[PDB]
Amino acid sequence: CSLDQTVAPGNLTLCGNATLFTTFRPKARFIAPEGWMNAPMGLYQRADGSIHAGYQSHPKHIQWGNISQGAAYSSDFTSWTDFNGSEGYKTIWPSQIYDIRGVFDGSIIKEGIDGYPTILYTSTSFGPLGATLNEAEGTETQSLAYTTDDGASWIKLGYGAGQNPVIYEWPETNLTGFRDPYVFQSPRLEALLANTTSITNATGDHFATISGGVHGDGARLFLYRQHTTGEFIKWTYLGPLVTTGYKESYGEWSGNYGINFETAGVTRLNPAGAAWDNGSDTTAVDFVTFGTEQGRADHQNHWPLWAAVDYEVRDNGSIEAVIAYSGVQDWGRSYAYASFPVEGYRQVSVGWIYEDDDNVILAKQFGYQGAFTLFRDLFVKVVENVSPSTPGLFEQASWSTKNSTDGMSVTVTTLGQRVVPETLAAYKGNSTVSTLAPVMLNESAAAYTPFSSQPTDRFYALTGSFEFGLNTTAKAGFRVLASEEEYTDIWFDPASENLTVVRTASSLIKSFGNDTELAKVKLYEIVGAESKTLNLTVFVDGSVIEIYANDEVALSTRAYPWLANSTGAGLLADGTTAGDVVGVSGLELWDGLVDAWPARPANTSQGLVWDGPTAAMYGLFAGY
């Protein structure tokens, strides 16, 4: 095994465990110290204002198993510190018959058992588990634990009658899944249900959704309500909140609803951020965010979606969330988005970016798998004075339209997402910032034009505003992680409305994924404008490429170029002419970003281990 990145890569499968630990590794984002990670979990803002983030974790392995909560904290979403206890950076792990198969995703009751922060999580035990298997009741249950030391440790309730697990009965038969409890307070839902509380007797101030579905009949998000305020054992099933059809799709802008939901959450937003009104704020919109399974041919059969919903009260004292419009939270290799409230009327969302090594060819050589996305403020994006001639505007696919009284303009409403400002400020302030001159892309434009200042490593951010003619057929964008032989091309093609990431040349290492990523982006044309603009922000962080368009569209993906000099970046142009010109302005390079884990050394591998021959006997975990 040669690690010479000035020549072509050899057979890297001969390399030892964790020999490629630093080669492709993100430095500026949330990631476990080593080993396997997946979904964020247990997210909450602590009493001191800091952020506690948990994650599905399997240390010293590069496949899922014995799944536990790893945890860390930060005062600014950006610079983090690991917890360190008797189980290293783990704070919850399988330990009881009810959760021995895995401590799955869970969410936080901030004032829970004895007033302490409390996690409601999916406790798993033995048996077939999965949307495509024949799961039985008991395999997935929901259990409580609380912390008396701000997340350094958690104490589970005892096993038994009237204790853990607290939710175990399936609300309907033949479930495809029954997990990922999302606990939330909702003045909105309380106001809606207030006239029906005699029917159910459920009067608590916390609601919980559980994600699942029904075999052959589509996904379900099940709604429970805490039976009595201040008491956390009894949760009353109200009814299904969201019901979708077997592999139903709302269309090209909305992914596919699959067969089973996962990691679903419920929030309420207005243009500024989180909305905690009872329905009285006419600018507020109710949203559900959710993953779906088996409605996608690639990306691990997983769509991370969202929907705006209008709540209706059923006669039995339950809530139907009727989907008004439906979109995609991220179009790339990410999933398992969790959102949580943050002081100052914010709802912040974060997901998991998986690797692009689905055949597990170099995972051992990495010595880790997975990272988080960046943390994102959610809000209602409102675009005023939209031209009615915007192509496809009245499809109202992942947005709503409201006509002006005179019919000459439209107000567009959709889900907004933007990187939390703490991270943008820290990134910029710690980087070498190059403010670049604007560039007209015309007949003289090369296919690729390097920026006048270049990155120094694989940790940088780009921004640019691309102004297109209303009838353009030109394409433009950014090339990143680029040398002569390796590069990743991010294109927008306004004629097709497609944002693509072409990865056919991303790496000389052929075992990594190279499929083209694709997002739809609607450029809402403004009344009186003779052009349409794409604001593109790109974060390059080891192997992560995370793209944001117009504080709306997100696409996370992976690139693993071998060569040390595959770090360059610049502008892409295709079919730009004297007549079809793309004006690029607001161009800026931030080189370096932030060291997100300042206390960690460069190599935090502790080696990898094998569970031995019993892993196959038990059949629960791959074993490595």
Add this chain to the structure above:
Amino acid sequence: CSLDQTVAPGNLTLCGNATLFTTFRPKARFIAPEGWMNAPMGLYQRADGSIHAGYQSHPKHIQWGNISQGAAYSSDFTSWTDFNGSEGYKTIWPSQIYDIRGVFDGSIIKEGIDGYPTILYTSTSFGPLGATLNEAEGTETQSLAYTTDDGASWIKLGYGAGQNPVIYEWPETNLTGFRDPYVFQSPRLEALLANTTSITNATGDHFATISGGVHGDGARLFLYRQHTTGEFIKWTYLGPLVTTGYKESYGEWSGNYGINFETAGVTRLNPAGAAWDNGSDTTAVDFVTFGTEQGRADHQNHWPLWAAVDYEVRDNGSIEAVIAYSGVQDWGRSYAYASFPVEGYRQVSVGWIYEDDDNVILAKQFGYQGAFTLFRDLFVKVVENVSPSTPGLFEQASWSTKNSTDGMSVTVTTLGQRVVPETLAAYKGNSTVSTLAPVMLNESAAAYTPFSSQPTDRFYALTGSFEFGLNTTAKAGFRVLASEEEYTDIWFDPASENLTVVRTASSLIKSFGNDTELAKVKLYEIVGAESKTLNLTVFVDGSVIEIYANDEVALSTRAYPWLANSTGAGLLADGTTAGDVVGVSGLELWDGLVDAWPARPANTSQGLVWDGPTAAMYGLFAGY
């Protein structure tokens, strides 16, 4: 619920949990503080000379589940003290994927991991488990833990390759069971295998048997040898040590070998006790003790057996233990005998006495189930100068015969069992002892003759020597726990060779078992004697009746009389006449015995709990 024991019992099923805690409870023997117990485990003499005893334990329940090691210690086998740690009196419990279904029976390596006492135990996980089910590999494995604090706590080896579990591969397919590892040193087996160690490479000084069998083809005791001295991970399967047939019986004196072995151990004894020679002691005999399943119509389908064996070395470097003769360790409601070495060349054996409430009618009202037997010294019983006219002597069923050179006398050899002298001394010394006058049972003998001194409670011992004519048809014995309306009759009938416990009147409470217990007892007639003698010792301890005959035959059973005055005792006589007389001598009553748990209050119940609806979902434990 009335607890008036001066009148007939009401409907005791209306009584609350643990309301009958003290009513029938042993006071003079090893028993858990409360709840469910079964098999002894983890028995060893500690460095300070005290005895550590573990037991299969499920606190706050009255059926088996979450099975754990409860533990206590004693300097004299007789007066005990509970361990008290973070899990009460438990010291090992289910905690890992490999043992989450139960910490089953295990045995002690005295100089194990890092020189510390080390337990090798059956770690169980999910799946069908049982001799009559379709068990699969992995469900029962064998794991290690060690103690740095003389049994107050145990540290398990880690889960994984080269660590726990240490034995997981089934030595043959389609096993009925794979559990109860018995670790032992054996100069005998080492000497026998010394010429074959090149074949197997196994040269360690510890052996281990694992108890099981093969579906449709009888029981098996599998022999392993520690691969390398001072190393405890690698154990090499040599071959089957004991192989018996599907429900094979050696006859009337030997129970039935069933379909599966449990709790089997290997020892070597001579007339004084334990023998640690290499084969050079011609007075020493190799023994296996073992439980069998499904070869019995009652007594929970369980026979606690033993066999004298002659070892043969196989060509592949393994040992066949060929059964020479075969007997019964206890004929009553006991099982799961474990033996362990004790200083002064002793091997001490102890088992578990189950209740006689198999339909679980009053178990909750008890608030506990189970006790130990008394601790028993094992030795080779040798009877010299036996008359060749002893009926049935040359059947050599559970004994051996060696003729004198002249053929006029026989030496009989069998397994001897006697209560450890520490217990007999402590019992007698703490009791009110009444030495009773000898009694001739003749034509004037009543059916029942109370002793001249009477017990004061349900805690006493009796002894007597019953001298019978060689052609007697009379029966004699002891009645115990007796009032006019309730009593338990212990009869010996030399003509049939049957020792019986008749329990048709043991209790007014009709839900307890009332079947007649039966043991065979061979009165070896001595050359020149005109009579034959039965030495009977009986311990009455709450509901336990534990009978010893001639330091050979043991029979443990249960009686639960309701009335407070059902405590009396005396002599039984049937068919005694002027010509057929039974001479009873050496009669002694010990009233009171010892308070075996001096630190415990009278009621150590902590209440009972229910596991809730998930118990049935998981299907592993009854849940109460």
